[PDB]
Amino acid sequence: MLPPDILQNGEFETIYFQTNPTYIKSPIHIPKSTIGKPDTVKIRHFFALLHQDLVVLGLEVFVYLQIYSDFVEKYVYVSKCDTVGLEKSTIKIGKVIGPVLQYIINYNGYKIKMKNEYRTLPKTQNLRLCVFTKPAKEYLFPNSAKNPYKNLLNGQSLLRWWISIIDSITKGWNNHKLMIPGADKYATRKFIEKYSDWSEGHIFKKDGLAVQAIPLFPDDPKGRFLELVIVECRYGKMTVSRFYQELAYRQEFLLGDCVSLIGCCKENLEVTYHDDLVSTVTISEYKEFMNLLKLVDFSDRVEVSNFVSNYR
């Protein structure tokens, strides 16, 4: 998952675990009218880099497997990524985030139970990588924002960073899409002028109803608007085009700092299923860890060190 020059034989350590794969309802509305509906399996990934007793950075990624008879639609959603900044930064953060996210994208050793011993997945996979960029001060690590070595990127800097990282791990993919809701075509294109494989737009179905095209990801700015569409039961009127038009005027975007949406796709990848023993936990155990994490003062070495030792 990480090369030797970053871990340095134990100078740095990793926290990495997955939830046990769990069947959920589709994050994209599928009319019960549809023929050959897929089963959806969700896996949460949590990663953190440790330097001796202290957390350096963290990354949370959710993987959704839409399992059809002959292929899988695989959505990889970056939930959260954050740094602590208690120590002067030794590794460039993208040299860690890039390889970890690439490992998670390509991981195919999930132990999936039968839908009511282990299910075998189709070999043909269509990949979708979904990332939003929004310069929040503390995605994962409370009160880290006033740590002395936390480098807080503004919105445009954060977007340039993510484009660089995502381009590096999606070489040869079929499309790379960028949208900055509320920005003109000219402003959006400047971010991808040096990226020949990137274009303006999004990766989802372009026509029809928005809730049948756009996935509802947790704690996603796009998903927050979709949630409103559904709670007001406008799911039968809202088109894809009008959804992205009105997304630009939401407070989170119009008052935000270069809030952007990235999507990348690779079609018809032949994969081989490949056991790779990693720590797996129940969803309750996963949530317990994340709830403990929210109660840590990441400006306080004592509390951070205590959190790490308790995990060990």
Side-chain angles (χ1 to χ4, degrees), residues 292-311:
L292 288 169
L293 189 71
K294 300 170 184 120
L295 292 178
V296 177
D297 180 359
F298 276 89
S299 75
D300 183 343
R301 289 163 153 267
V302 167
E303 296 187 35
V304 177
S305 290
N306 231 33
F307 174 85
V308 173
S309 80
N310 291 357
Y311 177 74

Side-chain angles (χ1 to χ4, degrees), residues 171-191:
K171 296 296 219 326
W173 287 31
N174 298 62
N175 73 7
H176 306 74
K177 306 300 292 197
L178 169 65
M179 184 185 299
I180 307 178
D184 49 78
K185 225 184 260 153
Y186 292 108
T188 306
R189 281 194 160 103
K190 192 171 330 274
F191 285 99

Side-chain angles (χ1 to χ4, degrees), residues 6-280:
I6 287 164
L7 292 184
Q8 304 173 43
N9 206 18
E11 184 70 9
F12 293 80
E13 193 188 331
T14 63
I15 296 182
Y16 178 65
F17 50 87
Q18 301 168 3
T19 55
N20 297 316
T22 300
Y23 289 91
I24 63 164
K25 291 176 186 170
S26 183
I28 302 177
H29 175 78
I30 306 201
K32 284 104 84 193
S33 315
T34 311
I35 319 193
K37 327 161 158 306
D39 294 338
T40 303
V41 174
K42 174 179 177 192
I43 306 97
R44 310 189 191 193
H45 301 247
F46 182 81
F47 171 86
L49 183 67
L50 310 177
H51 185 238
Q52 319 285 63
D53 53 328
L54 296 181
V55 180
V56 177
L57 60 85
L59 179 68
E60 186 184 46
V61 180
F62 303 157
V63 173
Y64 302 81
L65 309 172
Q66 307 279 85
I67 307 168
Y68 297 84
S69 288
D70 251 20
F71 60 97
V72 179
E73 295 267 300
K74 176 162 159 185
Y75 292 81
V76 180
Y77 166 66
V78 174
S79 162
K80 288 177 175 60
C81 172
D82 202 5
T83 60
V84 175
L86 281 168
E87 297 180 307
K88 195 252 191 285
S89 150
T90 310
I91 321 90
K92 273 188 185 173
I93 299 293
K95 296 303 220 184
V96 178
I97 295 305
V100 170
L101 181 55
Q102 184 162 47
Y103 173 90
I104 293 170
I105 288 164
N106 291 302
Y107 185 89
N108 293 299
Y110 299 120
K111 308 293 283 165
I112 304 175
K113 295 244 152 92
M114 308 304 299
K115 193 163 181 295
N116 274 98
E117 195 181 7
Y118 292 110
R119 186 177 184 158
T120 315
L121 273 42
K123 296 164 177 179
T124 309
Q125 286 191 5
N126 308 307
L127 306 183
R128 291 89 178 72
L129 173 67
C130 289
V131 178
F132 70 92
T133 76
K134 174 164 127 281
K137 73 183 141 102
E138 303 172 353
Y139 271 113
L140 287 166
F141 303 124
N143 281 328
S144 61
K146 265 191 270 275
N147 279 338
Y149 305 108
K150 195 176 178 163
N151 182 28
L152 286 189
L153 292 184
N154 63 21
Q156 61 173 305
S157 286
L158 178 63
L159 173 60
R160 298 189 175 287
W161 184 79
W162 267 116
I163 292 170
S164 185
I165 300 305
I166 291 162
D167 193 67
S168 87
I169 63 172
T170 57
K171 296 296 219 326
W173 287 31
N174 298 62
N175 73 7
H176 306 74
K177 306 300 292 197
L178 169 65
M179 184 185 299
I180 307 178
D184 49 78
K185 225 184 260 153
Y186 292 108
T188 306
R189 281 194 160 103
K190 192 171 330 274
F191 285 99
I192 50 168
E193 80 192 343
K194 305 300 190 207
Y195 293 92
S196 61
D197 283 319
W198 289 62
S199 55
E200 200 274 333
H202 65 86
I203 60 167
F204 307 113
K205 206 253 169 54
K206 293 179 179 179
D207 283 68
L209 294 172
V211 300
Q212 293 178 25
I214 307 182
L216 180 33
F217 295 129
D219 209 3
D220 173 6
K222 182 170 77 266
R224 279 185 279 273
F225 187 34
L226 271 176
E227 208 159 61
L228 183 67
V229 168
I230 290 157
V231 78
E232 304 187 342
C233 289
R234 295 151 56 201
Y235 49 76
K237 154 201 64 63
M238 180 92 272
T239 61
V240 174
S241 60
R242 184 52 53 88
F243 172 90
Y244 280 112
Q245 284 171 327
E246 285 288 309
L247 188 66
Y249 312 119
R250 290 225 93 203
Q251 293 183 33
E252 183 161 30
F253 289 82
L254 205 44
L255 305 181
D257 181 9
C258 187
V259 183
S260 309
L261 307 164
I262 293 168
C264 295
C265 294
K266 177 152 188 72
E267 311 304 314
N268 293 315
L269 182 67
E270 181 136 48
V271 306
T272 318
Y273 292 78
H274 190 244
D275 287 308
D276 179 8
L277 207 46
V278 301
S279 168
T280 61

